[PDB]
């Protein structure tokens, strides 16, 4: 609401990995890959 709490946001290189393996070593997986950097062009001042 309103118009206080402080939160922290991650940035940089991030990986998440959830593998699953079969008897033939087949891999079923979900992977998240994120690369982010701070951009001065779109930063505001409040």
């Amino acid at each position: 609401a309103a118009g206080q709490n402080v939160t922290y946001k991650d940035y940089g290189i991030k990986l998440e990995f959830e593998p699953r393996v079969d008897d033939d070593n087949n891999v079923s997986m979900r992977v998240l890959a994120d690369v982010s950097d701070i951009d001065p062009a779109t930063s505001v001042s409040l």
């Binding site: 699953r20 393996v21 079969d22 008897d23 087949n26 079923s28």
Partner: protein, 50 residues
């Protein structure tokens, strides 16, 4: 006594997407821009009879 597999090997799909856009524009502003509203004539009268 038979057991299932941990998972089924699905088929993999490749997706190729193309987005194309072209924009063109022209802008012209030429000529002479005169006034269209000007003051007109005036007349006044005043007198004291007494």
């Amino acid at each position: 006594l038979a057991t299932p597999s941990p998972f089924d090997m699905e088929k993999m799909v490749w997706l190729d997407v193309n987005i194309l856009e072209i924009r063109k524009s022209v802008l012209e502003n030429f000529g002479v821009d005169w006034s269209k509203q000007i003051p007109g004539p005036f007349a006044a009268f005043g007198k004291d009879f007494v």
